[PDB]
Design a protein around this ligand. Structure first.
Ligand code: NAD
Ligand code: NAD
Ligand code: NAD
Ligand code: NAD
Ligand code: TCL
Ligand code: TCL
Ligand code: TCL
Ligand code: TCL
Lengths: 259, 258, 258, 258
């Protein structure tokens, strides 16, 4: 038998809303593997859900941070430094684009909506990686969540496609810059999973059924499959893997035209 | 001999500073091919030189527009519409990132520097495509300029790599959205060329040397090689090509280790 | 106007069967630009129609060569050497996989069928590049044809996808090796075109109609669009471009879903 | 603590010569995790090491099979079926190119050498996948080993690069074809590790030493890092992952320059 024991390890998981959150799926596996887990949630309105998540993990520290707010980010990492001392793992599971940007055409994206989507969904990784850098121990890691539309056009995903392209390029540069400290940086490209944010993509259910039709495994992936890949990449089992975008999508993205 | 005749065609080329500007290389080829060319320049400061470029083309309309100013962009496309009635070609040859963003580590990029880089270097394609769309005729096209660092780490290119990654994904979505109206969208991935903007990349000389050492052709590309590719992509010869990032880099980007 | 003038340039186009052949489209454009074009065809049974193609091009030189027969390849380049003295352009428009391989599953491909597919569709490029190398002039080039199934799974393209992956990797290595000599090597990734070879892909008509529905341009490409890209890549207008796979597919391969 | 218990599961690992073999590292992890392992070695001359490897694992069935020999492959899988009744995991850690193909230029590769390289290094995945299919249980998988020269030119890796492009394309097609039964197919793209075979790449030590200087992690990967990725991809932890080429190279291949 192989055991993954992360006793002694400290994890901060940013971007949890409820138990369907992919950030949460990774937090669960990290806690199960023995790490101490802190969750960050976006706004006070989400505190009651974050409390339920801490409880479902059997214990987790909670912190409020909006990634557009540099003061709140400073306070987060100050709080994590005080509670943990050093940090091993950082999970970045945050994305946003304004409803109107997702519902219209990409070409019709308003300037301030476009910038907000990039700010929240891509710049935030840089914001948190910079603040995490002095805390992160040798062997530690940052993992983010991205989607195939960075490479190929998925209708209605619009500015998020572009944010994910910026997010993946960021992963490579941060991997290059944090690598000498023995800190790894990777992206999980997840296939469609029915989360809270899934409702924000028009035609998500079409995407979802389409993936299950065409993917090599002829099924959608699960939250736990994302959780397990996040666990692996953060664990010492993945000690030689950095700067990568690793797909957990039942093979969907390798497919060209079928039927 | 085969002929590329763009008589009757109207081009807008955005982002010329001087005669070494990649956008100007594409402008010169479109003009030589017989197209009528309008140029846009960033700021009143650049006007005297913009006029020298208009002159080197044997005439070109000039418009000033900073792509962070939506009203300047509105005015620019009102001006083009009045002057030309419509448009066939749009060249987007615009990028910027603060000096501090390019001198430091990517991880140390300040929020507002990061956002400005993406706004000027990527969002601008969207802002100009939207405005050009009602003017753009069937057979028409948009071409932008990118660099390999979108795909692979080129140290110190930093936030511009991320902006180019955004630019390239923008090219794909914009190709998808404009294609039904018969308008193509492509990016040219140029290798290093000594332009005014190259002086804003600290390691440029090192990059230039690596390319000459490593590239299949054992040399750097030229301004004219960029111009010729832009001409081709905008021309009817490229009528089947859209959503593409085409490399003009002497083969550099296909090389691994040597 | 710009003029592409290839007067005095010499081309060999390998893999013509009929007027729909992609190699023929590129031959016709090279001839239009003023190049002298020789053609090669595979076997005696194809000679009558090949002669008609040669006649269509002002009476082009015609050679027989099966790329599995090294002796025929030697005779081909000896004959080209005698006729032209050297060579500027080489077009490689040749693929085959046995019917058994294409109609089954990839996993069920027989050893000998798989090897023949790779030999004809991938190794042949190395075989002709090697023999062309001493004839090839500075500024010269080789262009081959591929399909996006090298990167993405297209059911029933089977071993040919794998041969095309081998082909594209071959293009990168040959570009590296011929580059010092000022010879470029590139691939054209064409979208579906209704050629005689199309009948060898089960369900091709389904594939063709799907492209029209979902490509950015909401149509298939044409044989001529392939011919124009071949011309461009071989011409000095593309002098900065080597080791590339350039897609002419109406944008199809950029679409991720639907 | 989270556990991976592969008790009850059966593995065939093909291509061990050495305790430094990447195939052996994967077998060691599979055995650690609880799996019953079978090993195939190439030739009678490797029996004694094979036996010591089987000792090192704590016991392992041994078989001899040359991947060019269909009868030896049929006997392998009949033997495996007899001993295990079914298979859960197949590791394909086999590659070969003739010395002469590796030592010069890709363009100079002789027909027989090119074919054999493709036959042993790419076709063998299909041959073994076909024979494994009826034995392979739902949740089962196949993992192979590749190298980044499939996408980027590494001089002197030559035909092996082309074989790896074929292999990775084969992984995508076999993943598609085996996916319906709940069987996954993936590739590990390893960075340089000092094995017997590494020495058959001219300049390997300098390639090895260069990675340690330029990789994001500023070191080479270890045999154990490959073994852990193999274990992960074959285990249920990777149940959502198929058709993937996963890089374990200390980030080396993300670098674009310097
Ligand atoms: N669900 C999927 O099918 C899928 C597929 C691929 C990638 N992803 C990515 O996974 C990540 C997590 O999304 P999810 O699907 O779990 O949905 P989710 O809604 O559960 O999580 C998204 C989180 O982003 C947070 N967030 C948004 N704006 C924020 C801001 N300004 N500051 C701080 N937090 C903010 C929200 O509060 C929320 O917790 C995202 O990056 C998403 O793009 C999701
Ligand atoms: N020179 C190279 O080696 C190279 C290589 C690859 C890609 N590129 C790209 O080519 C394009 C052209 O750059 P170039 O090298 O010709 O240099 P350049 O300086 O001649 O052109 C860049 C232009 O961007 C304009 N610009 C910057 N900010 C602007 C703003 N706010 N509003 C309006 N215009 C603005 C500048 O005024 C300038 O004319 C850029 O997108 C660049 O990233 C250049
Ligand atoms: N038609 C398409 O939609 C399409 C799309 C992408 C790529 N391609 C590629 O374009 C190239 C040309 O094919 P095409 O579609 O014009 O069909 P085609 O039938 O007109 O040309 C293919 C040629 O290959 C030749 N050939 C086959 N085996 C040979 C051998 N042993 N020796 C010498 N010649 C041999 C045939 O004689 C034939 O002329 C091929 O490589 C094909 O894979 C075609
Ligand atoms: N070592 C590295 O740095 C590295 C990097 C990337 C990929 N790889 C790949 O990993 C795999 C394993 O190689 P390795 O480095 O562990 O070296 P190795 O020498 O330990 O393993 C190579 C194996 O291939 C076998 N083989 C060759 N021809 C065969 C044939 N005809 N029939 C059956 N077996 C045959 C040999 O017997 C040998 O056991 C290979 O596919 C190789 O291409 C290695
Ligand atoms: O990136 C995603 C991809 C998929 Cl398939 C499903 C959900 C995703 O996540 C989001 C999508 C849109 C917005 Cl506005 C916010 C988020 Cl978190
Ligand atoms: O993108 C580029 C790539 C190269 Cl190799 C050289 C110059 C380039 O163009 C720029 C680089 C930095 C800034 Cl601030 C602005 C511009 Cl226009
Ligand atoms: O590669 C191709 C791709 C397409 Cl879409 C259409 C035709 C093609 O060409 C071939 C396909 C199969 C065989 Cl057996 C031989 C050839 Cl020339
Ligand atoms: O593919 C490889 C890549 C690397 Cl970096 C090191 C070793 C490799 O493996 C081989 C290399 C050459 C030959 Cl002839 C056979 C094998 Cl197994």
């Amino acid at each position: 038998m192989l055991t993954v024991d992360l006793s002694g390890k400290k994890a901060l998981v940013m971007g949890v809303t409820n138990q369907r959150s992919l950030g949460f799926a990774i937090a669960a596996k990290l806690k199960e593997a023995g790490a101490e887990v802190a969750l960050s949630y976006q706004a006070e309105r989400l505190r009651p859900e974050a409390e339920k998540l801490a409880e479902a993990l059997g214990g987790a520290l909670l912190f409020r941070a909006d990634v557009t707010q540099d003061e709140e980010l400073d306070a987060l990492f100050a709080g994590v430094k005080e509670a943990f001392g050093g940090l091993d793992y950082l999970v970045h599971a945050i994305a946003f684009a304004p409803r109107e940007a997702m519902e219209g055409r990409y070409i019709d994206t308003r300037r301030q909506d476009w910038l907000l989507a990039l700010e929240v969904s891509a710049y935030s990784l840089v914001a948190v990686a910079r603040r995490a850098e002095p805390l992160l121990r040798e062997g530690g890691g940052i993992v983010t969540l991205t989607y195939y539309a960075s490479e190929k056009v998925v209708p209605k995903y619009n500015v998020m496609a572009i944010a994910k392209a910026a997010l993946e390029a960021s992963v490579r540069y941060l991997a290059y810059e944090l690598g000498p400290k023995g800190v790894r940086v990777n992206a999980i490209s997840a296939g469609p999973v029915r989360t809270v944010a899934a409702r924000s993509i028009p035609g998500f259910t079409k995407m979802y059924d389409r993936v299950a039709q065409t993917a090599p495994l002829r099924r959608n992936i699960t939250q736990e499959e994302v959780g397990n890949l996040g666990l692996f990449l953060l664990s010492p089992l993945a000690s030689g893997i950095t700067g990568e975008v690793v797909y957990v999508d039942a093979g969907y993205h390798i497919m060209g035209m079928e039927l």
